[PDB]
Symmetry: D2
Subunit: 116 residues, 4 copies
């Protein structure tokens, strides 16, 4: 796991379960190419998006589909998604955990980056 996504619900104090996550990588023509996707587990975590081989240098966007998550709980939230955009691996491979804490009208995101 060079890339993990962890999502928490700040209203319930719980993992945010079954939240859709789409990862994109900026292509040579400046467009966002689909890179990987998945859903968070019971623990609010999404493992296995990629491999150290596949996860090369680049600019990556992690789009967490928070609006669908709130709507299913009966809540009409402000944001369409939480986006996280960053350059990865530009000094060598690292392991990235992208953490998102969700409320209906706010979210935070935090990266924890470790040298493998």
């Amino acid at each position: 796991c060079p890339l993990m996504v962890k999502v928490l619900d700040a209203v319930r104090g719980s993992p945010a379960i079954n939240v859709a996550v789409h990862v994109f990588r900026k292509a040579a023509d400046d467009t966002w190419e689909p890179f990987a996707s998945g859903k968070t587990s019971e623990s609010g975590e999404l493992h296995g998006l990629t491999t150290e081989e596949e996860f090369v240098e680049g600019i990556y966007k992690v789009e967490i589909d928070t609006k669908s998550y709130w709507k299913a709980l009966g809540i009409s939230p402000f944001h369409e998604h939480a986006e996280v955009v960053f350059t990865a691996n530009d000094s060598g491979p690292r392991r990235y955990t992208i953490a998102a804490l969700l409320s209906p009208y706010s979210y935070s995101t935090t990266a924890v980056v470790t040298n493998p």
Copy 2:
């Protein structure tokens, strides 16, 4: 004037209105002595807590009574209150705004320290 408190509600996307706020100063015997208090306004703000003359260097605690705010909304909260504890410094900027962003199981707090 030298100390303002501002409180926002991350669930409703609004000022947190009618939130009790208690300020204490630490006494020489290490106890907390009541110093000032009030309730946030319609804009989620509490002004007028103290004066330049009274707000001398020392250790202060700002308690924000968050549990009663969520209970009034019928939302089950985790914390009894949010506490913000700091040392007032004369060398720095002259105005302290303590901002607090509230969710039922999370809060953040940020000090913005400026020259007025």
Copy 3:
């Protein structure tokens, strides 16, 4: 007037001054069309981005150029920018303040939606 942006620096406890901010609207072909932009003031605020007349319902993106802000400070940051993506609604309150709290490896964003 209907859309304000406010940015704070959690490392220095200050407004984040001179931060570029770009607003886009989503077009019918699903692309992002430039809509408005500016730089935060000394108070970390950006006013005057749009008018009531122009700010019709639709999907908007607010990009806050955080990486250039940290680089100017000599602090190595994680994100390229902070994006805030939302649907403007006429049924709700009439003013949207997008607040962003910045740290090098984390940010939060909160929408405060009020009647002016």
Copy 4:
């Protein structure tokens, strides 16, 4: 582990290592009695504070000594500590993770509460 504390550094994007944490429990006479203490590990986590037997109903305060953490990194931060105050186990035993995200002039805290 009915009680875990996890601390992250938002400036470095890393676990906050060797941070002192003191837990107190409100006594019958309304005073704060020492309950447990420890330091965060390499992973920014502090396990083993208590047991399900020892961790009875009550009002608990988790004091995270963030000022000492920043000072050792050369930073003079705003807060003396991050305090987290909550009622525990009042509907039966639960498992509590208290997470704190630290910046020099801001912090957030979030509880994740699971029914064992």
